Structure formats: structure tokens, C-alpha cells
Design a protein around this ligand. Structure first.
Ligand SMILES: Cc1cc(N2CCNCC2)nc(C)n1
Length: 185
């Protein structure tokens, strides 16, 4: 792919984070803490899952960024509507305003309803995410395997501004403590 030139500098929005997340001072990394991080509650925070949004909002254009997932056992990545539900239980699906892929239990899925099996021969250490707002496209690339395509959501109905979306995943196993990191341009 030749999407690298639409690169955007993404930073994480502390105010949207689940209360157990630790966002770095540069707002480029996030990890699961072992306890509540001593923040006040607010209506923006994801309550049920270790989720956070990027600060940037996109309503036009082509955007590309990369995320480091090295040594993680579980995570979700993609984009979502600015108006997604924050509280309680919900599915990551386009009907609920999410365009995402996951790792869980040694398999990769796309967040369709129902979910779609992904075919990845080289487990990725970095994921590239491409959004074409006007075309209604969200695509995922395997940076570890020369940029190979992972998955394309097409005919997307965004229906609002989009935000970068992250889930660091739970760490019940003690093997999923590693952070998500936004990779340099
Ligand atoms: C990586 C991951 C897993 C997950 N589930 C929750 C329901 N049971 C199956 C596992 N949910 C999310 C949002 N992310």
C-alpha cells in the first residue's frame, strides 16, 4: 500500500479513558494499570472495558496511523463514531458505530456482526489503520509483513465524526500488561 503519506499524529484523550488506564505524558502510549488511577468519573469514560479514544476528530479526507501491539495477548483497534455508547455492555460492530479488528485467544477477528475470521500468517507487532472518509473505507495493514492487507470495511456508514479507537484488553492472565503505542511517522 501507498497510504503512508496520509500519516496523521494521533494522541490519546485522557478524559475518555477507562479509570484503570495509564496514558503516558506524551499521550502516545496507554496501558492497563493494576488498580483505579485516582481520576474523577465523567460521562465520556468507557466504564466496562479498558478503552480510550484519540483526541483527533475526522469528518473528511484520508488518514493513516500505526499502532504497536508487541507481546500483547488481547486488544481491539480501529475507529468509531464520536457518539458511541460509553457505559454498560455493548458489541463492537458497525451498527453500534465501530470499525475494528481484535486479537483474542490466539485468533484475529474483524468486528462485523457476527465477527469475521482473519487470515494472518505473520502475527503483527505493528498495525496500520487507513480511513477514507468520502469513500466509506477503513482498512488494516500488517506492518510486520511488508504492509500486507488484513481487512477492509467498505460501504461504511460513518454517520458522524470519527475518532481513533483503542482497547488495551484485560490482564486476567498476567501476560497482557504491555502497552498500545502510537508509532512515529
Ligand atoms: C479482545 C476482546 C475480547 C472481547 N470479548 C468479550 C466477550 N467475550 C469474548 C471476548 N471483547 C472485546 C471488546 N475485545
Amino acid at each position: 500500500h501507498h497510504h503512508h503519506h496520509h500519516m496523521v499524529h494521533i494522541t490519546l484523550d485522557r478524559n475518555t479513558a477507562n479509570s484503570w488506564l495509564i496514558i503516558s505524558k506524551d499521550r502516545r502510549q496507554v496501558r492497563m494499570g493494576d488498580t483505579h488511577q485516582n481520576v474523577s468519573d465523567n460521562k465520556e469514560r468507557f466504564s466496562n472495558y479498558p478503552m480510550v479514544l484519540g483526541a483527533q476528530r475526522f469528518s473528511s479526507g484520508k488518514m493513516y496511523w500505526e499502532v504497536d501491539v508487541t507481546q500483547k495477548e488481547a486488544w481491539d483497534l480501529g475507529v468509531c463514531r464520536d457518539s458511541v455508547q460509553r457505559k454498560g455492555q455493548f458489541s463492537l460492530s458497525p451498527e453500534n458505530g465501530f470499525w475494528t479488528i481484535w486479537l483474542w485467544q490466539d485468533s484475529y477477528e474483524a468486528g462485523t456482526s457476527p465477527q469475521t475470521t482473519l487470515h494472518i500468517q505473520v502475527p503483527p507487532c505493528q498495525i496500520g489503520i487507513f480511513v477514507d472518509y468520502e469513500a466509506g473505507v477503513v482498512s488494516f495493514y500488517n506492518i510486520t509483513d511488508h504492509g500486507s492487507l488484513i481487512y477492509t470495511f467498505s460501504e461504511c456508514v460513518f454517520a458522524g465524526p470519527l475518532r481513533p479507537f483503542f482497547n488495551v484488553g484485560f490482564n486476567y492472565s498476567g501476560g497482557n500488561a504491555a502497552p498500545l503505542k502510537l508509532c512515529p511517522l
